[PDB]
Subunit: 482 residues, 4 copies
């Protein structure tokens, strides 16, 4: 009702090119995380409807792959344009359902938009090889072709970007895709589906399914038609999805939990590290995959860094995403708040000091006071688990050799940040760090052209860049007798 | 004992760079598939020995990865030369335990060697990117680094080559590897470990563990130290290994089962076709992963191809691998023979016809008569199972639409072969075929410069070429503030 | 004149981002090649004006290269959109000043636009390297940066497309460019430049200089600020420009003359070969760099091919470009008419038989009759020179060995065309052909994704594809102590 | 004389696979630059002898290109294996003919051999692409093939490594090569040619021509058979060869002259910067092309740098190459000595001061005292010209912005060196420097895996790395109708 185009808010799922309600007419409700008020209902679908979405995708494949990359890119770039054109609404829809301040959601829409554009262009560059033959009577030619029907289970913390990142490459490679978005935040996904429809995406090529994650998830992983699956969420769930895809040996991309260390050295520019700490810890209220989970600060600047950070934090305003000056929104749901409190409680019981914040905000719901902790030790839960909230735990380190042992002492290896001004120390530490991504004197590393992903328990594959499309195609060796 | 160097025949496993028997002193016996005799005993190890193997690898990693690509190349190249130098003995050991003729045994050592050399060279070429930044204040640098400790489980059909194909890339990358080879053929695996040891491979970088396939398998898949696992074998086991590797989200390479179509068209050169048929079918007594399973012949040339194939097959000489003039050795075990008999009896029952062979060979043991069958229809078992024996089942087709349907009518998609003279037809059929590898006017396609692997249920990833090494490295994004 | 945007027609040059007359008010006239009428005037500049353009490009470079690839892509994309939006006007200017039919000029405007788009995207993908080091205390990083001020000299046959193919990859790579279009068709370049102003290309980044070919040329080649030059035209002038460019060791793209053989084999589809002949021979009245210069038809199908070619030639309509249905415009000038005459007269004199046309057309001016010749032999002038007109010289041949020798008996090696069905003969002949580009069973091969360029005396470098931007960047190796 | 294999010293040229004296039986003499004592005679050949070597190259091409890359690699690896095994004598030949210390000569042998190895491996990896078509009816296939007959003209500073830098990539590409080495140091070329003959390099594939620089060069550049030319030497000669090659549009690789700045910033590790000064200024007695020509040291560190520099120069023992402890052999000839003295006198005349050296060494001939100069300004000769002698001229600088202007105030741009410890500065400066190669906190940059070459008047193309082979091959685009 508050949009230039209210038909962007959808209360039906998108199955095989058609807008539909659940087969049983079951629906669940979606609430504004800041106010708690109802935003309406969406379908509560399951295995049967997902099966139809998968079949449709299979039936849509031959016609979609038969197009040139240039043609697919004409549709994708039309989709891109529509996303740009409806920027203000898409952002409002997102802010309302997910929480983040309008400025951040407009960032997310432009961010999302750029993945569509990037993969439109990449589609035209998926390239094979002609190679030198080891046998004179033979020639070697290698081509690439879409893998088949793709599926993707996206999370709630970036309800729009996550759709573009997973839809973009599949369609660009010549694949149809079935997407199950997060139950918390389905509107942003459906808003994308609707604009993709307008752009001229053929029926079946794109499906957004909404309902029960075990029912839909189970169908996706057991269905032999689905040849590749992408999942961005918790490490725990990702391990299970790998197990359920094992019977049909699916090609997997897994984007799992992190535990980002953010390292402020002896010789770092302190102010800039503080600028980069606010960005890497407090944007999206600390709920991103890439968010700092552990601060490691050198003895010799610990005291000075902590003050500067405490100051910086106190200039951040908490309030509803639609209010001006507002930079920290609510935590997504009730369970998110209880997690932060748990980490704070564990730290306090183990000897930590509350520098600032530490409790729920008076505005209620998901709002939580930006928190800084000092004297954080590695026996505390925050050393081993992700907070997913606005909490800055500061560990102390003495030596570069101790740091690397500290930073790496974790199951996960997604993002990592490092502030130092010495060229040789930067490399030595960056190289030693078991992480897929490393920010060097920057707190913001995410973009469309760089390969995004983790190592170790943070999963498999890479999204964005020229590396992004690789997982969505499969390779063919042609050995030609001459 | 008929070797220039009798110490190549090993009866102890190679753990952490130490020759050791099982912790409980247990053993199992290896037999000669051609003559039934005893080739000796090897350790029957299990979990605990594999665990020490795995820890040894981790202990060895820091040192091995800190060598330059060139320094690693030196050692691998010495191992190459040592494998070349000891070709005859390696060929004898291989024939003795596996069955294949000496010519094919020597063929494999040569093939195995070229992999070692190839990856030695590739290691010096594993490369990252520098990409144009989307932010003026930042710089994008991409680097590649070893994933971690690797594991490989290899089969018996190529008990030397498979070792080079999986040890080679790992080491080149900068990875240590634990290798559990087939219990039917362990000596080939050990002999190269022995030659690798002499080449200067430091202790812990290579292990060859021998014994209980389930116990050793479970240890490998559940151990968190193992970050990537390669497996070549049956699709049924591949699926389970992917399930078992899930709790740790390991990088998987799977070279699983196939169901190769050999395709003879209207305008094929029949004499060339028959030459390719014999080679793609009767290599290694039909026991390669890429062996023709289903012959599809066009109705115009069906009777002529059948007569020419039948005549050629009947002139092939069956004997023990060491016997000069013999081109067909034994099937590996009793189970293999019975499978071939089952496939024949099945086809015969359903109305097919015997053209040559069909029975077990007078020499007994694993010796089976090279067999050709006409009148084979898609309802017969061999249409859906791999034979892994010297059986040419001739199916029949009329059109180009029909053949694509029939050839792709399987869960598998490894190797396929296509004989036709029309360029337009060649490309058309090569694109429509869902296989990772396609021979065009040839029946021999396997080399070290071409990427080897399948699609669908044939597996994940590629081996050989510049593609082979990518699954042993992990990529790192560096965002550098400017 | 009679266009939606009359201001698209330009009568001033674009020196350093500002529209200017010659320093000395001098001009020269431009005439319609179909009807001889004065189309208006354009400046007659030289060394002085060219030096300001060059000096302007250097002043603009710092601010242009400082933009992200993303940003430059946007500006080029705005230019792309305008080129598409104004497609109809830009066609008529092109037809009016060059002569080719409207359908063809429209086709060229799209071609031209597809190039702007392509390099907009390639600009974002110019990539360097991180390499495995051969000395453990060092690290190798390769990066790529714009070369510097570029210059381009373009021909008259594609006066829209050539501006796109040279301005596109330059600006995309971070490079400024000074252009001198063919003084026979300068409006099409000026129009493009005008739309680039509208797109927001910063003053100095683009310059279109018009006037004395030799003075602008000699100033381009003598000036040390021009670090790279791109030339598309005759081999004669290409050889001179390389020499003039030696004292500053410029980077050179040279797209020179060809002598394209059109090869029709024994077992070809005759009807597709005729379709191929029409498009490769008579499009833009035989005035393209890739236009067939010599037909080689197998003895066995000579008459059959000649008859069908004669029939299809007669089906073409000669007339002015603005008239509907007209498929053949005039030859761009009188000297071009005299070249065609010179070639025909020589063929007859040495024994060739005329089969259609052979003289100038009734419409006068540049109009010449569609011409086919038979009994053509290697002693003829057309065997060694490019006609650049609607002349189809048919040569005879009796074998594969003989064809390769005939097709290669030339100093040139740009485009070549081959019609055959036998997979084995295609590869043998395609490989044996000393040409940069080979069309197989097609007569049209020009597009944005493929590397366009020749070998031998046809020049150096490649335009388009991902190879196209590479000559516009210089590579820097950074050796970094650890 | 005193060499394990006295037949490595050749007094005859190598033409088309046979050792010949000139047609006219003319010769000229080769002296030791440390004693003046005659080392023997070599043929003084001309056009006629070159022309033959070229024709023999054209003849040998087909049979050389026909071999697989692996087959060519086995021949190149035996040549590698013969250079390593005979490195002792080859070093001694090199010292004797050129001057540099025995130990340095050995480093060059191992350096030259590394190139042979690298390209043997690279030849196996020359790759084309398969690209996504913009037209459904067509397929895009790109292959690479050898360019044809290659010529190389090599200088004296590296009489062995330069041979291998040009021959390796050529033979690996599938080309034959005619090499004319420096008239002053021909024995390294000839010894390696001899080894190549023994290695199994087919006759005609490699020729080494000795005689009149002007006569041989002119034949090479005028002959249309020669389709590409690789040159390393002075910029002046480079400009002439590009002019001479213009009538036939030859593909050029030009490694031309430098003007390297070694930059010592405020925050450098001064001891390490000295270790890099010594390594970049006095290696090969200042006679390398990547030699430091201009030292730029910051105001704060100026004094302290100079003191430490002279303090390391005193440890450097000038002596004949065979004497133990000799780290500085003689310059090549009197003309080089006259040049060093020319700069020193001009610098003194304009204000500079002598720190150490400044005179001819007692030993005479072409030995010269290692010289350091303080108070050098831009107005001096050594500021614009290359010394090619042991002369460290120390320039003073204040701001960063100033340094970039001074460092780039030259037409040349091969190597640059940069010492600084601030990550941000290293990147800002290294990006701003107009040079093909920049060394970061190191004086030694040259190796086989990195792209070697310059920008601006320093030439065209790259040597070593995967980029090295690209200039030896040609791109063929195949547009296949399907």
């Amino acid at each position: 009702g508050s949009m230039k185009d209210p038909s962007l808010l959808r209360h039906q799922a998108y199955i095989g090119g058609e807008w539909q309600a659940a087969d049983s007419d079951a629906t669940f409700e979606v609430f504004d995380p800041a106010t708690g008020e109802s935003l309406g209902t969406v379908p509560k679908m399951g295995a049967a409807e997902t099966a139809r979405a998968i079949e449709a995708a299979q039936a849509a494949w031959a016609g979609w792959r038969m197009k040139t990359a240039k043609e697919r890119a004409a549709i994708l770039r039309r989709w891109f344009d529509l996303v740009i054109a409806n920027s203000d609404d898409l952002a409002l829809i997102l802010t309302t359902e997910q929480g983040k301040p309008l400025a951040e959601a407009k960032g997310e829409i432009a961010y999302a938009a750029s993945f569509i554009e990037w993969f439109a262009e990449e589609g035209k560059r998926v390239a094979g090889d002609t190679l030198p033959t080891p046998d004179a009577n033979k020639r070697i030619v290698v081509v690439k072709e879409p893998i088949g029907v793709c599926a993707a289970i996206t999370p709630w913390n970036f309800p729009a970007a996550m759709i573009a990142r997973k839809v973009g490459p599949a369609l660009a490679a010549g694949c149809p895709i079935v997407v199950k978005p997060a139950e918390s935040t389905p509107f942003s996904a459906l808003a994308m589906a609707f604009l993709a429809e307008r752009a001229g995406v053929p029926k079946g090529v794109l499906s957004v399914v909404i309902g029960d994650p075990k029912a839909i998830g189970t169908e996706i992983t057991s269905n032999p038609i689905v040849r590749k699956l992408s999942f961005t969420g918790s490490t725990a769930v990702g391990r299970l999805l790998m197990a359920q895809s094992a019977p049909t040996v699916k090609k997997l991309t897994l984007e799992l939990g992190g535990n980002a260390p953010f390292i402020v050295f002896d010789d770092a520019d302190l102010d800039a590290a503080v600028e980069g700490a606010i960005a890497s810890k407090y944007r999206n209220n600390g709920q991103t995959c890439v968010c700092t989970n552990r601060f490691f600060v050198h003895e010799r600047v610990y005291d000075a860094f902590a003050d500067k950070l405490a100051a910086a934090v106190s200039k951040l305003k908490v309030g509803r995403g639609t209010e001006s000056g507002a930079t920290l929104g609510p935590l997504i749901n009730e369970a998110a708040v209880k997690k932060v409190e748990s980490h704070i409680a564990d730290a306090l019981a183990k000897g930590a000091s509350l520098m600032t914040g530490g409790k729920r905000h008076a505005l209620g719901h998901g709002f939580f006071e930006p928190t800084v902790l000092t004297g954080v030790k590695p026996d505390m839960d925050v050393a081993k688990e992700e907070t997913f909230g606005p909490l800055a735990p500061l560990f102390r380190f003495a030596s570069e050799e101790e740091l690397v042992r500290l930073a790496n002492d974790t199951e996960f290896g997604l993002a990592a940040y490092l502030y130092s001004r010495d060229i040789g120390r930067v490399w030595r530490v960056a190289e030693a760090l078991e992480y897929g991504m490393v920010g060097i004197n920057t707190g913001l590393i995410s973009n469309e052209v760089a390969p995004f992903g983790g190592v170790k328990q943070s999963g498999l594959g890479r999204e964005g860049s020229h590396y992004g499309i690789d997982d969505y195609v499969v390779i063919k060796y042609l050995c030609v007798a001459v």
